[PDB]
Amino acid sequence: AVIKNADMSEEMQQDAVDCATQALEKYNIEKDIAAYIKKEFDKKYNPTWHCIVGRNFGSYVTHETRHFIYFYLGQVAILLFKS
Amino acid sequence: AVIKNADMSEEMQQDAVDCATQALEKYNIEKDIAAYIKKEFDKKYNPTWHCIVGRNFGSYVTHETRHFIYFYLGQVAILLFKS
Amino acid sequence: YTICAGTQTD
Amino acid sequence: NYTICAGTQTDP
């Protein structure tokens, strides 16, 4: 797990990584992987989260401070943020 | 321009397409393209917009009604929505 | 009102 | 106001 950019507590970062890890074990399709992570975070840390999972994409978003992480798990990039 | 999924007025859909078209002429990096579109929509339709541009990604997001578009410009996918 | 939506490139 | 903008780009 390589964190490329973050504005997030270390504990919440580890939870994002763990949640993404669980999502990748279960789901093959990026949209489903994203949905699993997004839903877990809405549940655990309140709405409203958004999650993008992919190999080739750029983004520009607005996030609540302390609630932004962008990382790779293997060759997969994951963007997860609250807005 | 191929619209894949929209919850947005026909008029705003046209604006999203024109905006993305202009961005692709000015920029070739996904992040820059996304930033162009996001900033223009924030300015014209109020914050808070988010934009994802890329050939390979899946997403799961939450959007205000009438403020969501997912389309292709050629082979590049664009997701633009307001939280 | 808000709606959840998913997208997937082909 | 607790918000800020950020951008991301995938590796080549």
As a whole number of angstroms, the distance between CA A34 and CA A10 comes to 21
Phi-psi region of B66 (alpha: psi -120 to 50; beta: other; left: phi over 0): left
Residue identified by tokens 């078209």 is B21
Based on the number of CB atoms within 10 Å of its own CB, is A28 exposed (0-12), middle (13-18) or buried (19 or more)? exposed
CB–CB contact A58 B31 (8 Å): yes
Cβ(A47)–Cβ(B56) below 8 Å: no
The approach used to solve this structure was X-ray
Quote the DSSP letter at residue B47: S
H helix count then E strand count, chain D: 0, 1
Cβ(B60)–Cβ(C4) below 8 Å: yes
Q: Tell me how far CA of residue B31 lies from CA of A23, B4, B8, B35, in angstroms.
A: 25, 21, 23, 6
CB–CB contact C2 A34 (8 Å): no
CB–CB contact B56 A51 (8 Å): no
Cβ(B23)–Cβ(B36) below 8 Å: yes
Structure token digits, residue B5 = 């999924």
Measured in angstroms, the CA of B78 and the nearest CA of chain A are apart by: 10
As a whole number of angstroms, the distance between CA A75 and CA A26 comes to 16
As a whole number of angstroms, the distance between CA B7 and CA B36 comes to 21
In units of Å, what resolution does this entry have? 1.8
Ordered domains of chain B (ranges, CATH): 1-83 (3.30.740.10)
